[PDB]
Every structure is written in structure tokens, then in C-alpha cells.
Amino acid sequence: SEREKRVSNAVEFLLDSRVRRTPTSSKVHFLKSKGLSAEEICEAFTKVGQPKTLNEIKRILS
Ligand SMILES: COc1ccc(CN2CCc3c(c(C(=O)NCc4ccccc4)nn3CCO)C2)c2ccccc12
């Protein structure tokens, strides 16, 4: 699905060593710009072992 593609692309992104050295807020804005919902972003951060609350992600994006 296009959803799973979005989340998979986010995971690959978040795993990058440079990206790991980038702040969460930056990453979150970036992912929204690529069309991901807050929920999809939250999924991705948990999948990579850097879990964030949906609440924190929505706050970044608010
Ligand atoms: C917000 O921080 C960044 C954004 C983009 C970049 C540039 N790329 C970083 C590595 C990268 C990117 C992308 C990427 O833009 N993929 C497209 C995509 C599509 C939908 C959701 C997420 C990513 N994927 N990867 C991993 C495999 O190359 C984008 C950054 C690079 C270093 C540090 C921070 C970056």
C-alpha cells in the first residue's frame, strides 16, 4: 500500500546515521512534508526503536 510505502520510507530515513544526529522536531516536520500523518510518523519512530508519543508528534506539528 501507499501507506506502508510511506512508513517504510520513513523507517529507512530515520535509520540513516546523519539523520540520527538530527533533532526530532526537524525530522517530524520533514516527514509531514513527505505526506505522512502524525500516526504514520509515530509508527516509524517506534519501528526504529526511538519511540515518541503521538502527543509529542502532534505538538511538534501544531
Ligand atoms: C530532516 O533531516 C533531513 C532530511 C533529509 C536529508 C536527506 N536524506 C537523508 C537520507 C535519506 C533521505 C531519504 C528520503 O528523503 N527518502 C524519501 C522519503 C519519502 C517518504 C518518507 C520519508 C522519506 N531517505 N533516506 C535514507 C536512504 O537514502 C533523505 C537529511 C540528511 C541528513 C540529516 C538530515 C536530513
CATH code assigned at 39: 1.10.10.10
Contact 24, 52 (CB under 8 A): yes
What's the rounded Cα separation, in Å, for the pair 32 and 3? 13
Query: Whose CA is closest to atom 30 on ligand 1?
Result: 19
Residue 12 belongs to domain spanning: 1-62
Q: Is 50's C-beta closer than 6 angstroms to any atom of ligand 1?
A: no
Distance in Å, CA 56 to ligand 1 centroid:
21
Quickly count: other Cβ atoms within 10 Å of residue 15's Cβ: 14
Experimental method: X-ray
Q: ∠ CA 22-28-30 to the nearest 5 degrees?
A: 85
Instruction: Count how many domains the chain has.
Output: 1
What's the rounded Cα separation, in Å, for the pair 2 and 6? 6
Instruction: Report the interhelical angle of 24-33 vs 38-47 (nearest 10°).
Output: 130
